[PDB]
Write a structure and sequence with these properties.
Two copies of one chain form a homodimer. Chain A is an alpha+beta fold. The first copy, chain A, is built from ten helices and twelve strands. In chain A, the strands form two sheets. Chain A has a seven-stranded mixed β-sheet, with helices on both faces. Chain A has a four-stranded mixed β-sheet with strand order 2-5-3-4. In chain A, strand 3, helix 3 and strand 4 form a beta-alpha-beta unit. Chain A is globular. The relative contact order of chain A is 0.16. Chains A and B meet through helix 1, strand 1, strand 2, helix 2 and strand 3 of A and helix 1, strand 1, strand 2, helix 2 and strand 3 of B. Strand 1 of chain A pairs antiparallel with strand 2 of chain B, so a sheet runs across the interface. The complex binds phosphoaminophosphonic acid-adenylate ester (2 copies), thiamin phosphate (2 copies), potassium ion (6 copies) and magnesium ion (8 copies).
Chain lengths: 305, 305
């Protein structure tokens, strides 16, 4: 069982209809759907840094795909295919069975094909997935575009995964191990959201990228943050730290005019949406709690920080 | 200095006019050229396995791009853009300056844009580049197209990089550190070559992928293998070993009819071309030396083998 048999045994299932050439050649081939731009991203997962060392192989495979689909969704785009680059310290059939099952379970959930990649030996388990999607030309939702008066919104709940990481064994570890990329919501926000980012590093810092790109600020209402009932019972200063600086949420944070927010609520969405503040002219991120200014020092996840 | 400053300092030179959305958002955007297919590949380099630990950062950056442009060329396609996923143990400005210089030197040599990527901390230096190209729809040169009677050809020289690795300091180390992706030759072989692969693992093993995909065999003439004058002066047995199983060549091995070969030889090419054998009906790779069968056992590079 060497490199090429590993690819054949675990990573070479047939794709959905729309792949001109999948695994088996030097590159993969995709015939573009008409009137669409290619949307492309890549994110790396390092064992022990992006997931606890004892994470199940299935959850490693799932999250390796999910975090990349999240960046496709963050543009308003529809995901199509992925490449899988994996560096393995050892060949372990049971690990490979579960990891590949996790890859395919995530791909199949969101209609994505695995069309290529690379397999290497390395001293440390490292995974880089490239995701490819398509969007109607010119309709991508950028990190720029937020305007004064726009609502700030976030999907789902924030802080779950960060609580789960420090409370391994708690049910909220499911949000650490199995984030849900908000694929359909991202598509439903095309033409409604004025800006958008996915929350991989922490709501405050990721919103900050929108604020900097859009040259605006924001005031967030801390008691509106959508946190789990478990986090509603912990002291508020640490509740805010999980919610705003925890990261690993893979929810969508977006801005939207009040008028377009009304339109969005009229849709049938597969995740909840919460308005948590609004965009303002002054170029600072500030916080308010129960009607008063709430000074808060927050730092999201950043490598080498 | 931390993650986001690193990206801005080293990996964020002004984006191509030909890129709809470059670095700065959750994904990159590309507007497809009309009547062309997307060609996409990704290859990982692990420090100490894909290059000597002491390899200069500039050479590491160059080769990270080059090996991926090679897989675009192996399809007959024109390279367009890359993503860069790098995992670093430490922040070293002198290393990052050289490495990013090598990334951009290779991109600029071949007209390619760096449009996105990912930056992580990890315990071991690991790089995965994704390359994107475009090709006239339907015209990709596949590993499965070889036909009985086709010539087997290879560009440049084979065995240089493998000798270089075993003789660090020798001028042939430059073929290990700075392989040349054969981009223009790949484009010139669109519509002429019946099959093609780039020689990353070893000519015999990589030719073997074509033979299996095409359900054919090949007979190669050992004294026609294009090797460096340095290898012409070493013992024959080791010469064949370097040439046929050395790997790291990043030359193009292709099959072509005699008639299309004559057309190819009338073109202005930036690399030499050698006919080294021919495709036969029996599904075996055999070798001939001085007009007699030459039994030979070689194995190319394969992880975990
Ligand atoms: N883990 C993986 N998952 C899915 N596809 C893969 C994976 N590893 C490799 N592939 C595909 O399997 C085929 C063979 O891969 P590979 O041997 O890496 O090709 P190559 O890049 O041309 N050679 P090399 O440069 O030596 O790695 C290609 O079509 C790859 O895209
Ligand atoms: N080494 C790199 N080379 C080129 N572009 C890069 C590199 N690292 C990151 N980028 C780009 O820089 C921007 C910020 O990257 P990044 O923070 O990784 O985005 P993200 O994936 O949305 N967040 P995260 O999931 O936390 O990594 C994106 O446009 C990336 O494509
Ligand atoms: C063992 C362990 N320690 C810490 C974390 C938290 N974590 C790791 S990377 C990251 C941001 C996204 O990464 P990137 O920016 O590299 O895409 C976060 C919040 C974890 N999940 N597991
Ligand atoms: C230090 C050192 N040891 C060995 C080699 C040789 N080598 C490494 S990977 C590979 C095949 C291509 O890799 P992959 O199949 O992963 O793309 C070859 C020929 C080297 N260059 N440096
Ligand atoms: K490849
Ligand atoms: K490989
Ligand atoms: K976005
Ligand atoms: K990304
Ligand atoms: K990152
Ligand atoms: K090919
Ligand atoms: Mg190849
Ligand atoms: Mg991401
Ligand atoms: Mg490869
Ligand atoms: Mg991050
Ligand atoms: Mg993102
Ligand atoms: Mg390759
Ligand atoms: Mg990233
Ligand atoms: Mg190989």
């Amino acid at each position: 069982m060497a490199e090429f048999s590993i690819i054949d045994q675990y990573f070479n299932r047939q794709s959905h209809p729309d792949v001109a050439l999948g695994i088996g050649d030097d590159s993969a081939l995709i015939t573009p759907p008409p009137n669409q731009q290619l949307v492309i991203c890549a994110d790396t997962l390092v064992a022990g840094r992006h997931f606890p060392l004892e994470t199940s192989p299935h959850a490693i495979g799932w999250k390796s795909v999910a975090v990349n689909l999240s960046d496709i969704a963050a543009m308003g785009a529809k995901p199509h295919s992925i490449l899988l680059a994996i560096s393995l310290p050892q060949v372990d059939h049971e690990w490979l069975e579960g990891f590949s099952q996790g890859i395919y379970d995530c791909c199949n959930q969101f209609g994505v094909a695995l069309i290529g990649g690379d397999t290497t030996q390395g001293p440390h388990l490292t995974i880089t997935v490239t995701a490819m999607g398509w969007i109607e030309t010119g309709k991508a939702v950028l990190r720029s575009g937020a305007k004064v008066g726009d609502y700030v919104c976030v999907s789902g709940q924030i802080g779950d995964a960060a609580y789960g990481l420090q409370h391994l064994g708690h049910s909220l570890q499911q949000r650490l191990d199995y984030p849900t990329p908000r694929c359909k919501l991202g598509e439903e926000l095309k033409g409604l959201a004025s800006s958008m980012i996915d929350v991989s590093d922490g709501l405050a810092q990721d919103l900050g990228h929108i604020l900097k790109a859009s040259k605006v600020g924001a005031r967030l209402i801390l008691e509106k943050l959508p946190v789990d009932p478990v986090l509603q019972q912990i002291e508020e200063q640490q509740r805010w730290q999980y919610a705003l600086a925890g990261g690993d949420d893979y929810e969508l944070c977006f801005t939207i005019t009040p008028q377009n927010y009304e339109k969005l609520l009229q849709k049938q969405l597969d995740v909840k949406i919460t308005m948590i503040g609004q965009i303002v002219e002054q170029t600072k991120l500030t916080f308010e709690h129960l009607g008063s200014d709430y000074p808060l020092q927050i730092h999201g996840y950043q490598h080498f920080a």
